[PDB]
Design a protein around this motif. Sequence first.
Motif, PDB file in Angstrom:
ATOM      1  N   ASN A 123       0.846  -1.106  -0.156  1.00 41.25           N
ATOM      2  CA  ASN A 123       0.033  -0.056   0.007  1.00 41.25           C
ATOM      3  C   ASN A 123       1.011   1.271  -0.090  1.00 41.25           C
ATOM      4  N   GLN A 124       0.611   2.079  -0.925  1.00 44.43           N
ATOM      5  CA  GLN A 124       1.419   3.232  -1.164  1.00 44.43           C
ATOM      6  C   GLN A 124       1.099   4.347  -0.314  1.00 44.43           C
ATOM      7  N   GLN A 125      -0.200   4.446  -0.113  1.00 43.74           N
ATOM      8  CA  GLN A 125      -0.665   5.687   0.811  1.00 43.74           C
ATOM      9  C   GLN A 125       0.002   5.481   2.182  1.00 43.74           C
TER      10      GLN A 125
ATOM     11  N   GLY B   2       5.142   7.486   6.460  1.00 46.45           N
ATOM     12  CA  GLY B   2       6.006   6.956   7.584  1.00 46.45           C
ATOM     13  C   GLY B   2       7.154   7.934   7.975  1.00 46.45           C
ATOM     14  N   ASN B   3       7.580   8.554   6.948  1.00 44.01           N
ATOM     15  CA  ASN B   3       8.604   9.539   7.006  1.00 44.01           C
ATOM     16  C   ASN B   3       7.965  11.031   7.442  1.00 44.01           C
ATOM     17  N   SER B   4       7.097  11.543   6.793  1.00 44.80           N
ATOM     18  CA  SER B   4       6.525  12.753   7.071  1.00 44.80           C
ATOM     19  C   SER B   4       5.878  12.792   8.557  1.00 44.80           C
ATOM     20  N   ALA B   5       5.824  11.752   9.231  1.00 40.78           N
ATOM     21  CA  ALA B   5       4.980  11.307  10.583  1.00 40.78           C
ATOM     22  C   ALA B   5       5.770  12.164  11.533  1.00 40.78           C
ATOM     23  N   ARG B   6       4.917  12.826  12.318  1.00 37.22           N
ATOM     24  CA  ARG B   6       5.520  13.564  13.261  1.00 37.22           C
ATOM     25  C   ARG B   6       5.982  12.986  14.777  1.00 37.22           C
ATOM     26  N   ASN B   7       5.190  11.941  14.927  1.00 37.77           N
ATOM     27  CA  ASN B   7       5.306  11.182  16.357  1.00 37.77           C
ATOM     28  C   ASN B   7       6.258  10.075  16.232  1.00 37.77           C
ATOM     29  N   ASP B   8       6.861   9.637  17.330  1.00 35.84           N
ATOM     30  CA  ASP B   8       7.694   8.509  17.509  1.00 35.84           C
ATOM     31  C   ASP B   8       6.862   7.152  17.191  1.00 35.84           C
TER      32      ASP B   8
END
Lengths: 53, 49
Positions: A35-37, A42-48
């Motif tokens: 799944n590409q979405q 995952g990267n741009s994600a702001r939390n650990d």
Amino acid sequence: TSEPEYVIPDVLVRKVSGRWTVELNADSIPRLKINQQYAAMGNSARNDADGQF
Amino acid sequence: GQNMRVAFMPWNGYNFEDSILVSERVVQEDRFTTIHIQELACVSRDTKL
């Protein structure tokens, strides 16, 4: 008397000119696709928590 | 079609609105006899058993 037709072949093998050749069943073979979405979230994600997750 | 001998006259109501009166000579002479062809087919359908 009315009895069904029922059997699903996994592989196939069929006399093309001698040296008959095996190919697998296309319809039968299972397949997973990334799944590409969620891959691009995952990267741009702001939390650990999220990122790790 | 066939060139049938016809006439224009009422005959005891058998030609009331749109009904045609055909003599027995036409039936006997095998006129307008039709042939039809029927096709039946069957397969084997190899099963697991």
